[PDB]
């Protein structure tokens with residue numbers, strides 16, 4: 038057990054191992070209760086997240102367990118992983134606070150690229166990295182579900198990590214929280230798949246190429262209309278898969294529209310980029326390109342290396358189907374904290 042010291046930061050007492058020095062709040066609340074620090078043991082600049090007391094309810098206790106399990110699993114260059122996890126508690130009975138330590142990133146994709154068109158070379162490299170991370174995440178049967186520029190963090194050499202794996206209110210109106218969501222998830226059409234994330238990548242890629250939001254809808258329905266104008270209205274085949282009968286019924290009220298010519302939308306773009314976008318932005322999720330398929334697309338010829346695009350170890354999510362008591366989720370979480378082994 039290391040020696041812990043106390044400091045008052047985000048209106049609360051942080052008790053952390055001596056190895057972490059010069060704690061300073063970051064993100065202005067937008068990432069949770071997170072402080073930047075210097076890890077004297079590793080020489081890394083790190084982010085330390087103190088969970089907002091994590092066992093207040095069953096829902097919150099399970100969410101705490103979920104986040105720790107996910108972060109402990111992720112071991113990939115393009116995905117946020119766990120450098121350390123600790124608690125000042127000396128026993129399960131004393132256990133009430135969890136601190137998570139990760140790499141400190143420089144900026145998110147949003148505040149970097151906002152309103153700006155990138156060069157094709159830069160788009161290739163950024164999207165390649167996202168796809169490389171997604172191949173890894175998907176190989177563990179994990180779906181991100183909320184990919185957008187604000188949960189893509191980059192450093193000075195354009196090296197990228199996926200992080201931050203919502204309420205009805207925060208998804209309402211003219212909001213970036215919804216602009217990158219696949220239509221089947223936005224409108225609860227069906228049980229969705231991993232390629233909900235590929236839709237999101239398509240939206241991000243389009244925006245990097247143009248400097249403009251692809252589907253900046255003023256509400257869910259306005260957004261759907263923007264989407265269907267580009268990709269065309271659904272055919273009978275997809276309509277049958279919309280298991281929601283009310284959703285299915287609303288779609289057939291719309292005047293039919295053919296898919297647009299993407300070369301006339303993304304004017305001047307690399308033809309290979311246009312081709313990839315056409316394969317990502319397919320309405321029927323069964324027919325969307327996968328992360329592994331996309332990595333082998335000719336657009337990434339200068340970066341693709343099938344021997345340097347690893348997959349994840351299997352990830353057991355059986356706990357999701359389980360209904361436990363707070364103290365049980367808490368004990369499971371404690372076991373995961375005390376069993377943590379840091380990376381090389």
Ligand SMILES: Nc1c(C(=O)c2cccc(OC[C@@H](O)CO)c2)cnn1-c1ccc(F)cc1
Nearest residue numbers: 063068084086137139140141142143144145190
């Ligand atoms: N590591 C990060 C960041 C960042 O590194 C980050 C993200 C965007 C911008 C950013 O810039 C920081 C600068 O403003 C200060 O150097 C960091 C944001 N959230 N987390 C995080 C920490 C612990 C966890 F368990 C999970 C996630």
